[PDB]
A paper describes a structure:
Two protein families are involved in this signaling pathway: the ER-localized stromal interaction molecule (STIM) calcium sensors and the calcium-release activated calcium (CRAC) channels (consisting of Orai family proteins), which are located in the plasma membrane. Next, the STIM1 oligomers rapidly migrate to ER-plasma membrane junctions, where they activate CRAC channels by directly binding to Orai1. The cytoplasmic C-terminus of STIM1 (STIM1-Ccyto, approximately 51 kDa) contains two extensive coiled-coil regions, a Pro/Ser-rich domain and a Lys-rich domain. Our recent study demonstrated that the inhibitory helix (amino acids 310-337, referred to as IH), which is close to the SOAR dimer, tightly binds to SOAR to prevent its exposure, thus keeping STIM1-Ccyto in an inactive resting state.
To better understand the conformational change of CC1 in the presence of the IH region, we determined the crystal structure of a STIM1 construct (amino acids 237-340, hereafter referred to as CC1-IH) and demonstrated the existence of both the inactive and active states of the STIM1 C-terminus in solution. One CC1-IH mutant (residues 237-340 with two mutations [M244L and L321M], referred to as CC1-IH-mut) yielded high-quality crystals that diffracted to a high resolution. The structure of CC1-IH-mut was determined using the single-wavelength anomalous dispersion (SAD) method. There are four CC1-IH-mut molecules in one asymmetric unit, and each molecule consists of an elongated α-helix stretching from its N-terminal end (referred as the head) to its C-terminal end (referred as the tail). Furthermore, two of the four CC1-IH-mut molecules have the same spatial orientation, whereas the other two are oriented in the opposite direction. As a result, all the tails of the CC1-IH-mut structure are clustered together, whereas the four heads are spread out. The two monomers paired to form the CC1-IH dimer in an antiparallel manner, with a buried surface area of 1,114.5 Å2 as calculated by AREAIMOL in the structure of CC1-IH-mut. Further structural analysis revealed that hydrophobic interactions and some intermolecular forces, such as hydrogen bonds and electrostatic attractions, are present within the interface of the dimer. These interactions mainly take place between the IH of one CC1-IH fragment and a region preceding IH in the other CC1-IH fragment. Specifically, the side chains of Leu335, Leu328, Val324 and Ala317 on one monomer (cyan) tend to exhibit hydrophobic interactions with residues Leu286, Ile290, Ala293 and Leu300 on the other monomer (green). Our current study revealed that CC1-IH exists as a long helix and that the oligomerization of CC1-IH depends on the IH domain.
Author numbering:
A (entry chain D), B (entry chain A): 248 to 336
């Protein structure tokens, strides 16, 4: 009698705990799962975008420099072509 | 790069947690689920046994009182046959 009543309170107890944990692994443990994805996707998106930025900055740099060198040659062309024409008064 | 490395720990830390929960869920929540059931079983088994003990002690008690009223009646017979026979001596 006395022995029972007591243990019962520990059952209706235990039973609510297991039900809160069943409330958590479906409300709490889901905000954390949605979030983990958001975070992981944002991070990977950024890592990949910095690899773009970088690779792009590099590409136009090459192009600039190629164009510069072509221009320094067109300078030489200009001067020498003018010396030719001039010499033929 | 600075602000990334930072949140990367954040994503690693949140990832460890989310892995515990899916393990405690599947090994500790499930251990408390066994125990709730056995506690519930034992509690119920004891209630039915108490009722069954009550039902039987009661049965015994009329099977006993009915048969004590009989022994008294048979006693009266014993005495009435005694006097009848005695008076035809």
């Amino acid at each position: 009698l006395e022995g029972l009543h007591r243990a019962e309170q520990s059952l209706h107890d235990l039973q609510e705990r297991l039900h809160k944990a069943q409330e958590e692994h479906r409300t709490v443990e889901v905000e954390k799962v949605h979030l983990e994805k958001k975070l992981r996707d944002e991070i990977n998106l950024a890592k990949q975008e910095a690899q773009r930025l970088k690779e792009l900055r590099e590409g136009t740099e090459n192009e600039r420099s190629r164009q510069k060198y072509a221009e320094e040659e067109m300078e030489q062309v200009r001067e020498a072509l003018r010396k030719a024409e001039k010499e033929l008064e």
